[PDB]
Write a protein that binds this DNA or RNA. Structure first.
Ligand SMILES: [Mg+2]
Length: 755
RNA sequence: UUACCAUCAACAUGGAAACUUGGCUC
RNA sequence: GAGCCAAGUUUCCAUGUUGAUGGUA
């Protein structure tokens, strides 16, 4: 609505592409009615049809979504319409009952605007798959694996600070043209006796979609004794056969009467949904196709859209709307007019942050990546590693030997005084050799700095066991190396340099720093990791900078009980982190910068109105401690795609471009920042919502601080999407949620052990 | 699990509106 | 009746990370 002033001073203007705008409003008022269909029919197709047949009284200018109706003229307080079914001529009483009077400029009409856009861009003959609409005629077919890809648009009208836009982005829906009945026919041809077990093992857990009501269901069972000539209850105590339920109530003809039923039992809601495999289709790239290089090469090439290809598909949508007379008529009866082009803005590109080291402080590039620029110069703090151990199994003499030999080669210009390791052979590849050898060597020798292990293949139970032994049982920093990582000796120097910098990091060593312009500040990140497999323990990692250069990050994790508020545990995280800051800096920080992750748009008021008051009131566990807290909420935000205006076309945006208007929300002071270097696709800018700013921060200074903290991540040698404490607390939350399952030892918490 | 980034297949959570059901209720 | 709680359905959305392919360092 109102144009907030969030713009800064520095940075270079950059012309950017965007989404679409059309609702310069000309309708007078919208009247929202609820429609009751007696007897009950749930299919939106002929429900929309019979509401169109009462155009004499309802008008021709409607907006319908099955149960909620919108007019621009006010009817009576109830209307009893008479309709006849197109199938069996059943007299159906329609009850047009006025529920709401919506002003068209308000945010209550955003679902109505979305319903009328799904109307107009459904009138382009684009089919409904999942949430979005996809072109079935501009498709591309992969007949070697029975797929089609439909290039469509996830399009939603949303009101932002610069106006009330249509966010359209180019999605690509993967439609498996073979139905679950057709896939079962293919399996029945492929497998004769064990067709039932193989189709069960492929099908259960996997996701099908019914296209008539476009609902996705996880197959939880297949029942073969049931057959759709049998009857089921239509929601009010009425038996009806499935062919009658799909012909009388859905209008379409079931061809095969021998097919089984698909059972999706929801979360405990409770009721066995029975589905038809003729009208169920699988979704997903097939398992015989992912290993094929060519098919996924075409699929990847055509979903990796350049900004020219993305804007070309959006302007194809615009031209299809404008060239269609009935679609432009259906949009313009509500006073809505689409623009001739996608919206454009003038964002700003943030300046390049200098990466500092021990002796050589260097500015970055336009690429914003310093892989080569950091492994030939001295790191700012390398503690020397003499007594370390390296563990390798029986089939890994050569790769481990060249790993340590090349490590001794590259540790010269990096600045690590590495010694030859303990050459620990591992007898085999189970838990009770690796784990037992590590703690038995750890008990005898108390001067081990870093334990490095080599794992063959990719396993989660063993890596969890090494990190469980090295974080909560025997506190020692540990590094885990894959053996397919070290398979190629060609590009092995850069990855061995990154491994050496990672073992420098886990030992408490410092890699690089950025020039923080403000003083005496404490940067904090958390990340709630919501648990879907252990019973709702939203484990809160917590990473807090404890020095003036923001290179030492003391981290604590707190576990949360189900339906337990985060008061008594995030209070402990804050008081422990301020106590650690009191030991190190011997004063108190004048600013605390907090970055939140794991927040949807409906939890913004909960975060801003419950959790920041409880943290600012839990700051009173010290004497007269009232700092200047700043809270940010981070959201990757994969809906928006910025383009860049090359003098002929649209190119990928430069790393570090920010936009702080016209897509931003009206209720907060916030922005979208593209920090990393994106080389394929359009980049995904990250939404940073300032729910609290007690420090009187500048509009420019949060951009520079969030970008400087995007440089600050020591596990990737360039800029990254989220800030460094966001990814630190993110991996800390993964460690404590999926790997450790319990808070780590405190003596490791002075270092970045989780990297 | 040396990373990071794109996009796809999903699942899960949360918000808002309308309706329905069951308790309270001036 | 006004209002609140709880649950469901239907619309509209939003976020997250699970698995994949890729990319380059
Ligand atoms: Mg998260």
């Amino acid at each position: 609505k109102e144009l907030l002033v969030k713009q800064g001073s520095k940075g270079t203007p950059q012309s950017l592409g965007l989404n679409l705008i059309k609702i310069q409003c000309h309708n007078e008022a919208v009247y929202q009615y609820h429609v009751t269909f007696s007897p009950s029919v749930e299919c939106k197709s002929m429900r929309f049809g019979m509401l169109k047949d009462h155009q004499s009284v309802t008008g021709n200018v409607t907006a319908f979504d099955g149960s909620i109706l919108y007019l621009p003229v006010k009817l009576q307080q109830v209307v009893e319409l008479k309709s006849q079914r197109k199938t069996d001529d059943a007299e159906i009483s329609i009850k047009i009952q006025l529920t709401k009077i919506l002003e068209p400029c308000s945010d209550l009409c955003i679902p109505f605007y979305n319903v009328v856009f799904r109307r107009v861009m459904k009138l382009l003959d684009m089919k409904l798959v999942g949430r979005n609409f996809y072109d079935p005629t501009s498709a591309m077919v992969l007949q070697q694996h029975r797929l089609q890809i439909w290039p469509g648009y996830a399009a939603s009208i949303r009101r932002t600070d610069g106006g009330l836009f249509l966010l359209a982005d180019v999605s690509h829906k993967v439609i498996r043209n073979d139905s679950v009945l057709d896939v079962m026919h293919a399996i029945y041809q492929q497998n004769k006796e064990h067709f039932q077990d193989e189709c069960s093992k492929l099908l259960v857990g996997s996701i099908v979609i019914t296209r008539y009501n476009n609902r996705t269901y996880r197959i939880d069972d297949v029942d073969w004794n049931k057959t759709p000539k049998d009857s089921f209850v239509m929601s009010d105590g009425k038996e009806i056969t499935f062919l009658e339920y799909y012909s009388k109530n859905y209008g379409i003809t079931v061809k095969e009467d021998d097919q089984p039923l698909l059972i999706h039992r929801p979360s405990e809601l409770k009721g066995e949904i029975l589905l038809l495999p003729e009208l169920s289709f699988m979704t997903g790239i097939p398992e015989k196709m992912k290993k094929d290089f060519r098919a996924m090469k075409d699929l990847t090439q055509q979903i990796n859209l350049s900004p020219k290809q993305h804007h070309g598909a959006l302007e194809c949508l615009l031209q299809r709307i404008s060239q269609n007379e009935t679609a432009s008529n259906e949009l313009t009866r509500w006073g809505l007019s689409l623009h001739k082009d996608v919206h454009k803005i003038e964002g700003r590109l943030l300046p390049m942050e200098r990466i500092n080291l021990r002796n050589t402080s260097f500015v970055t590039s336009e690429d914003l990546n310093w892989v080569k620029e950091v492994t030939r110069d001295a790191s700012i703090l390398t503690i020397p590693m003499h007594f370390w151990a390296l563990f390798y199994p029986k089939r890994a003499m050569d790769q481990a030997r060249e790993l340590v030999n090349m490590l001794e080669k590259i540790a010269g210009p990096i600045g690590m005084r590495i010694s030859p390791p303990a050459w620990v052979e591992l007898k085999d590849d189970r838990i009770e050799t690796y784990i037992r050898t590590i703690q038995s060597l750890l008990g005898v020798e108390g001067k081990i700095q870093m334990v490095v292990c080599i794992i063959m293949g990719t396993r989660d139970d063993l890596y969890g066991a090494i990190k469980k032994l090295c974080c909560v049982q025997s506190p020692v920093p540990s590094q885990v190396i894959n053996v397919r990582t070290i398979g190629q000796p060609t590009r092995l120097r850069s990855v061995a340099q990154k491994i050496l910098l990672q073992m420098n990091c886990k030992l408490g060593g410092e890699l690089w720093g950025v020039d923080i312009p403000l003083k005496q500040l404490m940067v904090i990140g958390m990340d709630v990791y919501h648990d879907p497999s252990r019973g709702m323990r939203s484990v809160v990692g917590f990473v807090a900078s404890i020095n003036l250069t923001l290179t030492k990050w003391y981290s604590r994790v707190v576990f949360q009980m189900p339906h337990q508020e985060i008061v008594d545990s995030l209070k402990l995280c804050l008081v422990g982190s301020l106590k650690k800051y009191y030991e190190v800096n011997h004063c108190l920080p004048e600013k605390i910068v907090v970055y939140r992750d794991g927040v949807s748009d409906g939890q913004l008021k909960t975060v801003a109105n419950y959790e920041i008051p409880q943290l600012q009131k839990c700051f009173e566990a010290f004497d007269n401690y009232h700092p200047k807290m700043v809270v940010f909420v981070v959201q990757k935000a994969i809906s928006t795609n910025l383009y860049l205006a090359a003098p002929d076309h649209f190119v990928t945006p430069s790393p570090g471009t920010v936009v702080d208007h016209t897509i931003t929300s009206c209720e907060w002071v916030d922005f979208y920042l593209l920090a990393h270097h994106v080389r394929q696709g359009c980049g995904i800018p990250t939404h940073y919502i300032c729910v609290l700013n007690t420090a009187n921060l500048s509009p420019d200074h949060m951009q520079r601080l969030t970008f400087k903290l995007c440089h600050m991540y020591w596990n990737w040698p360039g800029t990254i999407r989220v800030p460094a404490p966001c990814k630190y607390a993110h991996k800390l939350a993964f460690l404590s949620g999926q790997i450790l399952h319990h808070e780590p030892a405190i003596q490791l918490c002075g270092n970045l052990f989780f990297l």
